[PDB]
């Protein structure tokens, strides 16, 4: 499963190295930015952190801008108006699917992993 990969320290780092090879690491980063963000109980830190995550990965002039459609983008922008813990669930699902469907299967057929399973 893909859910196992995303749960382990080793797995994530290995998967990152691969995504770097295909210039799509921004996906995994955001997804990890979202799993930290939602643990925040304070409504101020959420407030600020939401502007940070949105500024880096979502925004149309974003440095690590992730590939999501117009609807999911502008929804996440209206979810900022009051940043709760779920603010990015939509954007985070689009991104998870992007990794699961497209680049996760290539990773399983990569030598990066092929060797580390051969070790396993």
């Amino acid at each position: 499963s893909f859910d196992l990969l995303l749960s382990s320290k080793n797995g994530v780092a290995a998967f990152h190295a691969f995504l770097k090879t295909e210039f799509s690491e921004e996906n995994l980063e955001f997804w990890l930015a979202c799993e930290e963000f939602k643990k925040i109980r304070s409504a101020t830190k959420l407030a600020s952190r939401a502007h940070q995550i949105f500024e880096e990965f979502i925004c149309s002039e974003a440095p690590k801008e992730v590939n999501i459609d117009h609807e999911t983008r502008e929804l996440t922008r209206m979810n900022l108006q009051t940043a709760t813990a779920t603010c990015f669930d939509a954007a985070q699902g689009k991104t998870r699917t992007l990794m699961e469907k497209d680049s996760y299967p290539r990773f399983l057929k990569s030598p990066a992993y092929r060797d580390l399973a051969a070790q396993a």
Binding site: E22, F23, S60, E65, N67, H70, L98, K101, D102
Partner: protein, 310 residues
């Protein structure tokens, strides 16, 4: 004699499908095991297509022909293959309100393979179902990043780099611009009446044109073979009598028929060339999902990549 080749183009123009057609042509087809791996995608492609139409009905305010479909729609959303879901999906698809919405897909975002999968639900929904080569070809997965794949045709070895077409992916394209032998630039002809999935204010064809102006005339590619695939011709053919090209080109004085409108698109792109004396856009009308056609076009391309590089 290793050649470096690029598939560039806006999102959903058909780059990844051309990459699949290499695996089929210049390797030896898909296995049966390899096909059984595309089940999930076909099923998910199908489920996503139909959700897309139904969500558009509440936005566009279109009624079901038969009010009991609301109850299936509910189940659809919650369930997302099994018999229950198939039945739900089938019943939704046959509904006249659903079909009125499907015939207005230009106002929202719908996978092009929708009709193909949905019209074939009986086969797909079977328990012992194994995708066909075409089913596999019809599958949609968003490419994110830059995928390098190596190929050996009859007279050429190819390093072939496939990229994502969406705006957020275009930053990354600069990683493979060095020593580029040829660029196949995909354009989805059927996009003339559609908007971008990443900007609803932006017509997809005007987007491809701006993109093409910038690649065609880019300094990096003075020495690269610019090849222009006018793709999804099959989808365009069955569109054009239903939806007029004036959506995309208000200037257009010609008939909304397949050949003339296709000749017109072609000229628009080809007019973007800023050094026509010295540079030649090699144009081909393609159906990416039609192996035979992509086989014939790739022979014509290869010849240009010999003539212009030896």
């Amino acid at each position: 004699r290793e050649v470096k080749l690029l598939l560039l183009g806006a999102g959903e123009s058909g780059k990844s499908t051309i990459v699949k057609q290499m695996k089929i042509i210049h390797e030896a087809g898909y296995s049966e095991e390899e096909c059984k791996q595309y089940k999930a995608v076909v099923y998910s492609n199908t489920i996503q297509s139909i959700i897309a139409i139904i969500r558009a009905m509440g936005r566009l305010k279109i009624d079901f022909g038969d009010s009991a479909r609301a109850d299936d729609a509910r189940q659809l959303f919650v369930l997302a293959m099994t018999a229950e879901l198939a039945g739900v999906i089938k019943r939704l698809w046959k509904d006249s309100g659903v079909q009125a919405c499907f015939n207005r897909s230009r106002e929202y975002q719908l996978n092009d393979s929708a009709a193909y999968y949905l019209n074939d639900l009986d086969r797909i929904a079977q328990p012992n179902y194994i995708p066909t080569q075409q089913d596999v070809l019809r599958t949609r997965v968003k490419t994110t990043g830059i995928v390098e794949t190596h190929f050996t045709f009859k007279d050429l070895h190819f390093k072939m780099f496939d990229v994502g077409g969406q705006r957020s992916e275009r930053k990354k394209w600069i990683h493979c611009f060095e020593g580029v032998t040829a660029i196949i630039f995909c354009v989805a002809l059927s996009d003339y009446d559609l908007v971008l999935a990443e900007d609803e204010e932006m017509n997809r064809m005007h987007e491809s044109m701006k993109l093409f102006d910038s690649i065609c005339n880019n300094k990096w590619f003075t020495d690269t073979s610019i090849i222009l695939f006018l793709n999804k011709k099959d989808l365009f053919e069955e569109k054009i009598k239903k939806s007029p090209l004036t959506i995309c080109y208000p200037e257009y004085a010609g008939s909304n028929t397949y050949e003339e409108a296709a000749a017109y698109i072609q000229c628009q792109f080809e007019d973007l060339n800023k050094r026509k004396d010295t540079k030649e856009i090699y144009t081909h009308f393609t159906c990416a999902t039609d192996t035979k056609n992509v086989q014939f076009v790739f022979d014509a391309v290869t010849d240009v990549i010999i003539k212009n590089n030896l």
